Scaffold this active site. Structure first.
Site, PDB file in Angstrom:
ATOM      1  CB  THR C   1     -13.304-106.085 -72.749  1.00 20.44           C
ATOM      2  OG1 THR C   1     -12.741-105.265 -73.949  1.00 20.44           O
ATOM      3  CG2 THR C   1     -14.252-107.080 -73.257  1.00 20.44           C
ATOM      4  CB  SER C   2     -18.570-105.816 -69.912  1.00 21.37           C
ATOM      5  OG  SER C   2     -17.849-104.549 -68.994  1.00 21.37           O
ATOM      6  CE  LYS C  33     -14.739-105.004 -76.567  1.00 25.89           C
ATOM      7  NZ  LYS C  33     -14.859-104.609 -75.080  1.00 25.89           N
TER       8      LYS C  33
END
Ligand SMILES: [Mg+2]
Ligand SMILES: [Mg+2]
Ligand SMILES: [Mg+2]
Ligand SMILES: [Mg+2]
Ligand SMILES: [Mg+2]
Ligand SMILES: [Mg+2]
Ligand SMILES: [Mg+2]
Lengths: 242, 240, 196, 204, 117, 198, 235, 246, 222
Positions: C1-2, C33
């Site tokens: 996840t970024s 997200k």
């Protein structure tokens, strides 16, 4: 028999016990508040039963958090109770939302609590009425709460025995100064109004007590009027008192 | 037999009955009507004491983004009902994943009232609740509940001391038009219709500081302000 | 996840990849997200999908109610709620969240609630596994009071890098623009970000 | 240590033409030590049979529990419980203890008194239901049983034949299990009648 | 809610009334000889067609060596008896000696008193 | 562990129990009684963890005694055991289980038959002609299986017991200091004070 | 749950009054069986008597009870009665002895008598049961929580009337067929209505058929009542 | 208020119970008639204003796909009773046997709910009486009436509330053990008419039946064991179609 | 186990294999893994079977009640939110992995819930041991705007992927189509490709082959 238990609705849909509680209030000291241009002033009449009382000590105005001022009339202890709960309610609000409790929020909090004491016969309504307010994210607010839990916002408010005299005085202010009123003025004004309201109880010497929460005079925080600023208004009232 | 909600020999609940009388204590009248795609509720606003801040006097509440509720009764019991209405509304959303339907909110509130009717320690609340919204499934809506724990949906309705006057006025309108709603596409007009028929039945004229209007359209309920009311109040002084 | 949220002149933007992995398997490659806790308060989610989804759902609720009672909540308040949940339940949570919101008096604001449950207010923030790689790039190319256009790119660049290097990140780049004018949803495909 | 492999024991149930059969071995042991050769694992509440294999104290307990339950059920409903119903009862009864289960493996068998359709079913220690029309097996020799069943079984057998089949299945499977044997019991169930037979087998 | 409370004259009506219930109950008697005690009681005759075989007898064993007979609400007795039997076994189990008649008595007594306050 | 053996002949149930109590390195006592009389026709022997052992038996005792009083009746051995099973089956899933094993021998006055019940700390109950707990079974079962007969006299059983005890003293590693034997029959419960030599 | 100045429990006494207003239940314990008969309260041509069960209930396969009082109040006690029965069976693997069940039910009632502040149960029971220790038994419990056992007894309306009639025709060596007859007879002479008709009766027996061993409880079906009625001669 | 509010009075009467029964007597009439292959329950929709919408008030409710209930007494008390009833049908039954309870049992459960109101501390009995109709594989069809006391009994036909006695009398004459559902509906309609003051049509009447299984109301096809719910409320149109055949 | 949920132009379809396994043994050669939560909301589950059944029935029940109480058809987001809050409550211990599909007033929906309580949404998903074989197919033939028939085939093939290439799956294919305007249609054994061939012999034993010691009649009635 409809006035013996609290929660009971009379045949006219009135809660008698609440109403008697009001009487306890009426029999009490006078107190008022004046919403001004950017704050609110609170003042109350402290009856000096005797010389044995230590001067300027039995403080009756109370603060909630750091920005709400509270003053009430009636059964003093019942008031303290109400405030304590205000304090607990305020903290819980801060803890979770960080921002100190907005006055309208606070008011509803006190309201809901009091209203609750008129819901069961195992509790007696609060023998007090409170005037309180302070500064918040958007302006000043002054409110008054009665034993039934009813509360509304005011431009000025008073309660206790000198109540009608006071209200009369307050009404004059609203009509002569629709613009607003500087914190300094309202202070003096409250001083006067109390001195005046004191006549309904013109038999004992009194001690005035004033407090304010102004965006320009006290940064939005609740502080008591003491020293130079207090003598100034005492005399202002002592002046226009004749 | 007349102090707690137990039965009387006639089979009645006096305390419930006296609660209905308290609903009138305020002396405010209100009414609500359904539009083509909205719902309006007007209620009188009466600010007696000059020392009151007129802006804080209301008996209309925003329950959720889509539900509005008007209360006929004392303010304390009113707010007490509001807070719960709000909560129940939120909790419903969190647990079910969609906004609480006004009718559902009403039934819920009604069930809570029934309880005070059956348990001796709880006094009923002396207030009558009208819930309005534009249901995503049912359209414009009005559901009213009372101290007896009764609740029902209305084509339009009114509440207050002068309840019957207003009702008959509206009853007549719907008997004439044949439809169960005002036939106007904009809320502004329905608001108008509403205020009009209010004036018509109460025999009084209203300024902007004597009314309180609430409107509910798809996905939002709002209360008009003085200024918004005026544009309505003005527009009406041309037909009548 | 970024994930990252950058505050600019007109407000703030939140961007994030769209990959959720269970080991080396890409369970979902089109995950969103960017979560709305309120109209103009959104949060970026990094950590246990379950932990965060829940926390979000709860904040969303606490805020709905806040609203009903006291009007529109500040971002600072949205943060405090998240913090409260994350901090008080630290022992049973693996979640790092970024809260970004828009307000008329405060413009845009960004808060990062790291693992310990602490809160830090920042000009922008980055988080997620891919964040390690772009601390340098970001601390270098970030300037305050940028235009929407500039900001969009800065986020689009930083995140394409992060996706480049971290395998736990990829898919598409999603953004959310919070300004007075409203809320805008942006999506950039691999075919674009991959070669920058 | 695996509660399901301390006392040993197996149960099997099969369906035929207008009948069902359910058998079990009789050994009760403590690890390697045979302790009793008279531990039937088949019980019935009216016309429904429940076979239970597993930790013996639990086998006992559950049996006690279902009687109790089927007894009250009969009082309230004024009729005997049915296979299908019992099954859901067993399941729900087991899942009740989802996080501290009874280490057992139940098998239900009976014929619905109204429909006449033969019925058998089985469960794992927490209620996961297995409903198959052919056969159900449980116990330490489950693998064995499956092998035998899958080979020996064929649908619509007459009571007299099903008998043989299930006996053989049980018998040979048991012979390949350490913790099973020491005797066997087989019930042949029909709408109107139920016959119970003990089998002669190796006592080792 | 406090039922057994004092009166202006220093009496606990409920306790006093309790006594009256005793008066209405059949008679019971016990006299102790030199190496024995005998307890006799009269049987209630409101209705007759009783199955003496089973009917709860008026004299009950608290333990192999202690008995208790009473006069009053037949129901109320059962409770005092049960609590007494249970305490008989309990004394054995912790002091390794059965109760003395006094003790047993002091126990059943304590129970009744408790119900008065 | 200690030895607990029972064998029900035709008119009674004989129970033999080791007399030794060991605590760590030393033998504390060489004359312990590992049994309690539940009712005048039901006896229970027991072996297991230190305190649990007695604490459990005494509890059962008290509870069976109280029923005898409240009801003016003596529970059948079968009844007494089911009760005991249930109490054990309940502790296996408690906070701290009673690590106890017991044998219950009783003469059922109603049926006019002797009865032996074996129940382990788990609640595993079973009825048999002869039984034992722990390792005791491993050495003696082979003998019991061989010589046991339903129509045995009380005397025949005591000899068979003797033989069993002999084998244990021969092949078993620990010194259990002999056994205490009790017979449960129609006339009650008597202690065969002659098992050191009979 | 308080005492009167006379040493009486108001609510209990008053409860009993309510009960006397209830239909009559009669239980006659014979040498080889027990009989329970009861007269139904408030009926009609439209009431479904066939699929009915309002006064006679099975507690256990060996115990049944006849009820006089609040049906609802009854059912509560009955359920907990059925449960104690089963608990005892789980614990001991033997059917609960009639007296134990009875004593237990009673103690519950007594509870309502001594503490709590809840109104007692307006119900009285007649228990017909069998067990291996005392054979056939017949018992009765009323709101005070008191219970006692009879050879024949009745509850509800016109007790004195009925008891007197029972004491008159009852004899130690009776037989079921006779007890049936007597039971009906008595009901018939104590009814407050026109005449005994099947549609107004509830009848049940507990016999131990000689060609077997276990006790069989049989609740009479409407037709069978009508039949048993003709034979005894009520027509 | 932890003590019973329903105590026994010197004559042996449960005050609050009798009063509750009085409240029931003043309620609108509702009836139920049991046929051989069905049951029907009906009531009247007493619109308390023509501004109210009749439909937003189901006086006839579904408890399980095979059991329905109608009442007479205080509606609110019924509303909450229906909730608790639907719930208990699940908790005390479908969640244990995977099927809905049989009418007598559910009836018995509801009964239990009311009895507790008759004795628990601090409450008043329920001011309603319900006619519960249903079917189940083993008992067939049934109709039951439940009272505030907690007393319940089965009927071939009955009516409760206002004109109960007159109605019960009309029913007593028309009913016989060979009735087909359409006929009972008819009689229900006839019986209802006599107690109905004003307009008698599909918008003032509420009939519901329990009959054959309706696959069309199931919601999905596939599983062949459950062929659909037996409870079906009649439509305004379906009602009228039968009224016109008076 | 292999279960897939595929959304189409006006509905959603879900399918699954039919093999239940205790370790490496095929216990039920045809169990059903398609559960009904409400008439038009079905879910397929993998993980601890007893858990998927339990959590299913439990929520289905609570869903049936919420409907009755609100007099509204059930909604998928509700089933979702409920499952997810319950699963999350049990920190992963209720090993239920579900794909819940269904139509309601707001349209068609397809979600997946992992036992820890996290949800996902997509036009096609799959779970189970066959998860990857099936997702491989979906990632190769899925396209936006599938007809009802294209989706069934797709979801059907995917299950076949898992059936042939995953030891954990097998036997047959179950399908359940939830089209918007229509009733949900549960196609049990839409596909049956694994039929055991006729045994090479008959193991029917000749009567009397078994050795019996004692015979007796069991009494069923009371
Ligand atoms: Mg005033
Ligand atoms: Mg109340
Ligand atoms: Mg009260
Ligand atoms: Mg990558
Ligand atoms: Mg296995
Ligand atoms: Mg073997
Ligand atoms: Mg495969």
């Amino acid at each position: 028999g409809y006035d013996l238990s609290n929660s009971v609705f009379s045949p006219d849909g009135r809660n008698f016990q609440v109403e008697y509680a009001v009487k306890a209030v009426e029999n009490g000291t006078t107190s008022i508040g004046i919403k001004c241009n950017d704050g609110v002033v609170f003042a109350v009449e402290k009856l000096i039963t005797s010389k044995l009382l230590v001067p300027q000590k039995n403080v009756k105005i109370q603060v909630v958090d750091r920005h709400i001022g509270c003053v009430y009339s009636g059964l003093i202890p019942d008031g303290r109770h109400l405030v304590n709960r205000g304090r607990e309610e305020a903290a819980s609000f801060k803890k979770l939302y960080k921002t100190p409790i907005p006055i309208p929020a606070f008011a509803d909090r006190l309201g809901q609590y009091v209203q609750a004491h008129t819901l069961y016969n195992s509790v007696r309504p609060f023998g007090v009425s409170t005037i309180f307010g302070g500064v918040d994210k958007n302006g000043a607010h002054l409110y008054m709460l009665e034993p039934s839990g009813s509360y509304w916002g005011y431009k000025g408010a008073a309660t206790g025995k000198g109540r009608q005299s006071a209200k009369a005085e307050l009404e004059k202010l609203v009509d002569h100064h629709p613009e607003g009123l500087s914190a300094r003025e309202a202070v003096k004004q409250a001083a006067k109004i109390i001195y005046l309201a004191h006549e309904d109880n013109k038999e004992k010497d009194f001690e005035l007590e004033i407090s304010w929460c102004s965006l320009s005079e006290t940064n939005g925080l609740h502080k008591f009027v003491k020293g130079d600023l207090l003598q100034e208004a005492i005399d202002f009232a002592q002046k226009e008192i004749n | 037999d007349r102090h707690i909600t137990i039965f009387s020999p006639e089979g009645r609940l006096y305390q419930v009955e006296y609660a209905f009388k308290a609903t009138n204590q305020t002396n405010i009248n209100s009414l609500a009507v359904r539009g083509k795609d909205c719902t309006v509720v007007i209620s009188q606003k009466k600010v007696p004491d000059k020392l009151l801040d007129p802006t804080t006097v209301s008996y209309i509440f925003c329950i959720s983004r889509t539900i509005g509720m008007v209360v006929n009764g004392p303010i304390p019991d009113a707010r007490n009902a509001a807070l719960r209405a709000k909560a129940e509304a939120a909790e419903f959303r969190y647990k079910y994943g969609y906004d609480m339907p006004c009718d559902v909110l009403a039934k819920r509130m009604a069930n809570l009232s029934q309880i005070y009717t059956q348990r001796a320690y709880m006094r009923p609340l002396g207030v009558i609740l009208t819930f309005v919204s534009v249901d995503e499934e049912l359209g414009p809506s009005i559901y009213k509940t009372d101290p007896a724990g009764y609740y029902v949906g209305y084509k339009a309705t009114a509440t207050g001391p002068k309840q019957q006057e207003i009702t008959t006025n509206l009853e007549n309108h719907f008997k004439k038009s044949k439809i169960d709603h005002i036939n106007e596409e904009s809320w502004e007009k329905v608001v108008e219709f509403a205020i009009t028929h209010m004036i018509d039945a109460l025999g009084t004229e209203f300024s902007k500081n004597d009314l309180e209007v609430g409107v509910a359209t798809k996905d939002k309920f709002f209360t008009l302000s003085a200024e918004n009311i005026e544009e309505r109040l003005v527009a009406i002084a041309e037909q009548d | 996840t970024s994930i990252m949220a950058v505050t600019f002149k007109d407000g703030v933007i939140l961007g994030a990849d769209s990959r959720t992995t269970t080991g080396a398997y890409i369970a979902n490659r089109v995950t969103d997200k960017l979560t709305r806790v309120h109209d103009k308060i959104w949060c970026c989610r990094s950590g246990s999908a379950a932990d965060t989804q829940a926390i979000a759902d709860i904040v969303q609720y606490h805020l709905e109610l806040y609203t009903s009672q006291y009007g529109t909540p500040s971002t600072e308040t949205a943060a405090s709620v998240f913090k409260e949940l994350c901090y008080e339940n630290k022992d049973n949570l693996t979640a790092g969240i970024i809260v970004a919101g828009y307000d008329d008096k405060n413009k845009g604001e960004v808060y990062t609630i790291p693992l310990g449950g602490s809160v830090h207010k920042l000009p922008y923030a980055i988080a997620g596994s891919g964040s390690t790689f772009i601390y340098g790039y970001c601390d270098k190319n970030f300037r305050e009071n940028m235009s929407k256009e500039e900001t969009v790119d800065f986020i689009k660049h930083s995140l394409s890098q992060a996706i480049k290097w971290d395998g736990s990140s990829g898919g598409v780049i999603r953004m959310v623009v919070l300004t007075a004018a409203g809320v805008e949803r942006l999506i950039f495909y691999p075919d674009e970000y991959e070669q920058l | 240590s695996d509660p399901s492999s301390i006392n040993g024991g197996i149960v099997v149930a099969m369906t035929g033409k207008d009948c069902v059969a359910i058998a079990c071995d009789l050994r009760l042991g403590s690890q390697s030590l045979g302790v009793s050769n008279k531990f039937e694992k088949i019980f019935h509440y009216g016309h429904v049979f429940l076979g239970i294999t597993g930790l013996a104290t639990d086998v006992t307990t559950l049996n006690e529990m279902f009687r109790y339950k089927t007894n009250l059920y009969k009082l309230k409903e004024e009729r005997a419980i049915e296979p299908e119903t019992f099954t859901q009862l067993v399941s729900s009864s087991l899942y009740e203890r989802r996080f501290g289960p009874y280490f057992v493996g139940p098998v239900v068998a009976g014929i619905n008194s109204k429909s006449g359709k033969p019925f058998i079913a089985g469960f794992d220690l927490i209620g996961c239901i297995d409903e198959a029309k052919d056969f159900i097996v449980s116990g330490t020799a489950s693998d064995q049983l499956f092998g035998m069943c899958e080979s020996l079984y064929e649908p619509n057998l007459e009571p007299e034949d099903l008998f043989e089949t299930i006996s053989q299945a049980l018998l040979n499977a048991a012979d390949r299990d350490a913790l099973s044997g020491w005797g066997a019991v087989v019930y042949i169930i029909k709408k109107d009648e139920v016959v119970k037979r003990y089998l002669k087998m190796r006592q080792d | 809610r406090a039922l057994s409370i004092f009166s202006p004259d220093g009496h606990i009506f409920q306790v006093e009334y309790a006594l009256e219930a005793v008066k209405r109950g059949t008679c019971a008697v016990g006299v102790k000889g030199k190496n024995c005690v005998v307890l006799g009681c009269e049987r209630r005759s409101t209705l007759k067609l009783q199955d003496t075989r089973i009917t709860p007898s008026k004299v009950s064993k608290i333990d192999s060596h202690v008995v208790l007979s009473f006069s009053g609400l037949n129901a109320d007795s059962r409770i005092l008896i049960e609590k007494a039997r249970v305490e008989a076994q309990s004394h054995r189990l912790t002091l390794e000696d059965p109760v003395t008649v006094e003790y047993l008595t002091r126990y059943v007594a304590g129970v009744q008193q408790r119900y008065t306050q | 562990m200690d030895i607990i053996l029972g064998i029900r002949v035709q008119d009674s149930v004989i129970l033999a129990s080791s007399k030794a109590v060991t605590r760590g390195i030393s033998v504390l006592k060489d004359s312990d009684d590992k049994t309690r009389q539940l009712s005048p026709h039901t006896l229970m022997s027991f072996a297991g963890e230190a305190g649990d052992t007695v604490q459990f038996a005494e509890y059962i005792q008290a509870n069976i005694q109280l029923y005898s009083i409240r009801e003016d009746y003596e529970l059948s051995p079968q009844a007494v055991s089911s009760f005991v099973r249930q109490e054990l089956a309940k502790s296996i899933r408690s906070r701290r289980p009673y690590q106890v094993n017991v044998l219950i021998g009783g003469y059922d006055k109603k049926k006019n038959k002797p009865e032996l019940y074996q129940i382990d700390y788990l609640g595993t109950k079973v009825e048999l002609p002869y039984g034992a707990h722990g390792y005791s079974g491993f050495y003696t079962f082979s003998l019991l299986d061989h010589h046991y007969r339903p129509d045995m006299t009380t005397e025949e059983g005591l000899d068979l017991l003797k033989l069993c005890v002999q084998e244990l003293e021969k092949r078993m590693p620990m010194d259990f200091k002999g056994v205490i034997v009790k017979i449960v029959d129609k006339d009650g419960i008597r202690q065969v004070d002659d098992f050191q030599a009979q | 749950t308080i005492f009167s100045p006379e040493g009486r429990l108001y609510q209990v006494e008053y409860a009993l009054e309510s009960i006397s207003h209830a239909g009559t239940a009669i239980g006659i314990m014979a040498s080889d069986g027990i009989v329970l008969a009861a007269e139904r309260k408030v009926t009609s041509t439209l009431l479904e008597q066939d699929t009915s069960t309002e006064k006679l209930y099975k507690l256990n396969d060996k115990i049944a009870v006849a009820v006089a009082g609040l049906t609802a109040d009854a059912e509560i006690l009955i359920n907990t009665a059925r449960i104690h029965a089963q608990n005892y069976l789980k614990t001991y693997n033997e059917d609960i002895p009639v007296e134990i069940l009875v004593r237990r039910l009673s103690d519950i009632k007594q509870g309502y008598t001594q503490h709590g502040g809840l109104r007692p149960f307006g119900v009285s029971f007649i228990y017909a049961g069998y067990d291996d220790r005392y054979g056939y038994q017949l018992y009765t419990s009323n709101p005070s929580g008191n219970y006692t056992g009879w050879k024949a007894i009745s509850v509800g309306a016109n007790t004195s009337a009925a008891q007197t009639l029972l004491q008159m025709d009852y004899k130690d060596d009776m037989k079921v067929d006779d007890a049936i007859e007597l039971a009906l007879k008595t009901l018939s002479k104590t009814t407050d209505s026109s005449a005994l008709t099947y549609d107004r009766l509830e009848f049940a027996t507990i016999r131990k058929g000689a060609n077997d061993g276990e006790v069989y409880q049989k609740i009479f079906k409407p037709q069978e009542i009508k039949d048993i009625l003709v034979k005894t001669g009520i027509t | 208020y932890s003590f019973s509010l329903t105590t026994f009075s010197p004559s042996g009467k449960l005050g609050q119970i009798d009063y509750a029964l009085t409240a029931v007597k003043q309620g609108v009439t509702s009836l139920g008639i049991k046929a051989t292959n069905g049951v029907v329950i009906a009531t009247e929709k007493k619109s308390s204003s023509p501004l109210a919408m009749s439909e937003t008030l189901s006086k006839v409710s579904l408890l399980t796909p095979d059991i329905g209930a109608v009442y007479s007494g205080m509606g609110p008390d019924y509303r909450v009773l229906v909730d608790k009833s639907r719930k208990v049908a699940h908790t005390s039954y479908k969640r244990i046997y995977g099927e809905y309870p049989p009418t007598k049992l559910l009836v018995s459960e509801v009964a239990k709910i009311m009895q507790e109101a008759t004795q628990s501390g601090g409450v008043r009995p329920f001011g309603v009486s319900l006619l519960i109709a249903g079917h189940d594989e083993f008992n067939g069809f049934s109709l039951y009436q439940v009272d505030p006391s907690g007393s319940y009994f089965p009927w071939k036909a009955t009516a409760i509330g206002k004109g109960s006695v007159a109605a019960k009398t009309f029913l007593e004459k028309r009913w016989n053990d060979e009735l087909e559902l359409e006929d009972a509906i008819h009689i229900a309609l006839l019986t209802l008419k006599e107690s109905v003051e004003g307009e008698f049509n599909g918008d003032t009447i509420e009939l519901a039946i329990i009959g054959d299984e309706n696959p069309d109301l199931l919601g999905y096809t596939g599983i062949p064991t459950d062929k659909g719910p037996r409870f079906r409320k009649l439509t305004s149109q379906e009602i009228n179609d039968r009224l016109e055949a008076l | 186990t292999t279960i897939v949920g595929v959304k189409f132009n006006n509905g959603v379809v879900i399918a699954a294999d039919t093999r239940s396994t205790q370790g490496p043994i095929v216990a039920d050669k045809n169990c059903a893994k398609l559960h009904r939560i409400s008439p038009k909301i079905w879910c397929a589950g993998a993980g601890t079977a007893a858990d998927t059944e339990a959590v299913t029935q439990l929520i289905g029940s609570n869903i049936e009640l919420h409907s009755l109480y609100t007099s509204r058809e059930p909604r998928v987001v509700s089933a979702l939110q409920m499952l997810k809050q319950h699963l999350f409550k049990y920190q992963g211990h209720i090993g239920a992995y579900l794909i819940v599909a269904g139509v309601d007033p707001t349209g068609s929906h397809l979600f997946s819930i992992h036992a820890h309580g996290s949800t996902d949404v997509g036009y096609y998903l799959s779970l189970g041991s066959g998860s990857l074989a099936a997702m491989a197919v979906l990632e190769s033939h899925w396209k936006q705007d599938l007809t009802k028939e294209e989706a069934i085939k797709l979801a059907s093939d995917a299950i076949q992927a898992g059936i042939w290439n995953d030891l954990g799956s097998g036997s047959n294919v179950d399908v359940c189509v939830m089209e918007i305007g229509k009733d949900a249609e549960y196609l049990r054994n839409y596909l049956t490709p694994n039929v055991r061939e006729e045994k090479q012999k008959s193991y029917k034993f000749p009567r009397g082959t078994t050795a019996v010691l004692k015979e007796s009649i069991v009494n069923i009635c009371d």
